[PDB]
Amino acid sequence: NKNMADIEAAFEGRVGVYAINTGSGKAYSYRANERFPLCSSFKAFLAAAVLKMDQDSPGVLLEKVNYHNRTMEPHSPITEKFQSQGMAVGELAAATLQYSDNGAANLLMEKYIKGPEGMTQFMNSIGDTKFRLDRWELDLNSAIPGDERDTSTPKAVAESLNKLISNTVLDNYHQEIFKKWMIGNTTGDNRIRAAVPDGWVVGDKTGTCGKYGTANDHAFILQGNNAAPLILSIYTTRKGEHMKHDDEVIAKAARIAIENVK
């Protein structure tokens, strides 16, 4: 435990890790049941909730969403690009996951998921008793120490991710699309992915609150030959509002987690 304690101390903050090898059951926990801010990491689950709506009602993914006159949230690279002609629901889901698109997240929670409460209800529906989304983008990023709004735990995030890819509420078709989106995420190259051996396929979703040095990443990792996935979930925060987060801390934590469950 010396490695992770030393990393956390030098980070001058809190590091939470949960990892599990879903083939062997070997797990690793470091502050795994403590709460940390979600930041954008909920957007992976939002995309999964949208997939579930489509599984219940085939064709939802292909519905057009029009938002011509909308004031676009900061950091909406995809939804801003396509505002003129709208976007399909599935395109919004891919964009909110793979580019952390804020407009796409709020559009999906305005028109399909029924707000942060609906997002929380989806997570409750898969047995996650820790997840809570309370606010919209970008207010949910305030990351105020001690505030449990818009938080979960590393373990709950890991367990819920595993449920979405192990035949619980998503069928094979919808799991395959979810996995494709995660594998195609564009924002995680310097976090969990930086610790993963060449050839192992990684799907992940990051979060970066921009306050209190708060950042995170969660992922499935496929060692190959259809081995059961490793699940990694890494959350961080710091005491001072203007402290920076540290991608290298998340990558170092990931290396230790992988070593301890592989």
CA neighbor of 49 nearest in space, from 207, 57, 180:
57
How far apart CA 47 and CA 88 sit, in angstroms, is 13
How far apart CA 212 and CA 28 sit, in angstroms, is 26
Beta carbons of 134 and 149 less than 8 angstroms apart: yes
Tell me the CA distances in angstroms from 41 to 45, 68, 103, 167, 196, one per residue in order.
8, 27, 15, 21, 19
How far apart CA 134 and CA 180 sit, in angstroms, is 28
Which architecture, in CATH terms, is 1-262? 3-Layer(aba) Sandwich (3.40)
Task: For residue 233, list its beta bridge partners.
Answer: 18, 218
Q: Which residues contact 225 (CB under 8 A, 6 or more apart)?
A: none
End-to-end CA distance of the chain: 17
Q: How many CB atoms lie within 10 A of CB 179?
A: 18
Output the CA angle 104-107-112, nearest 5 degrees: 120
Beta carbons of 26 and 227 less than 8 angstroms apart: no
Active-site residue identified among 24, 29, 40, 100: 40
> What values do phi and psi take at 254, rounded to 5?
-60, -40
Method: X-ray
Beta carbons of 119 and 133 less than 8 angstroms apart: yes
DSSP SS3 for 206: strand
Beta carbons of 223 and 262 less than 8 angstroms apart: yes
DSSP labels for 164-199?
HHTTSSS-HHHHHHHHHHHHT-SS-TTTGGGGSPTT
Q: How many CB atoms lie within 10 A of CB 58?
A: 9
Task: For residue 186, list its beta bridge partners.
Answer: none
Q: Which residues contact 239 (CB under 8 A, 6 or more apart)?
A: 12, 13, 145, 212
Joined together, the tokens standing for residue 112 give: 């399909």
Q: Where are the domains of the chain?
A: 1-262
DSSP secondary structure letter of residue 59: T
Tell me the CA distances in angstroms from 114 to 47, 99, 107, 121, 122, one per residue in order.
13, 22, 10, 9, 10
DSSP SS3 for 261: helix
> What values do phi and psi take at 36, rounded to 5?
-140, 155
Question: Is the previous residue joined to 46 through a cis bond, with omega within 30 degrees of 0?
Answer: no
Beta carbons of 216 and 39 less than 8 angstroms apart: yes
Beta carbons of 216 and 151 less than 8 angstroms apart: no
Look up tokens 């028109």; give the residue.
111
DSSP SS3 for 44: helix
Joined together, the tokens standing for residue 86 give: 């709208």
Report the phi/psi class of residue 91: left, alpha or beta, with left for phi > 0 and alpha for psi in -120 to 50: alpha
Helices 42-56, 172-183: inter-axial angle, 10-degree rounding: 150
How far apart CA 17 and CA 233 sit, in angstroms, is 6
How far apart CA 200 and CA 180 sit, in angstroms, is 14
How far apart CA 198 and CA 175 sit, in angstroms, is 24
Beta carbons of 203 and 174 less than 8 angstroms apart: no
Q: Is 100 a catalytic residue?
A: no
How far apart CA 262 and CA 257 sit, in angstroms, is 8
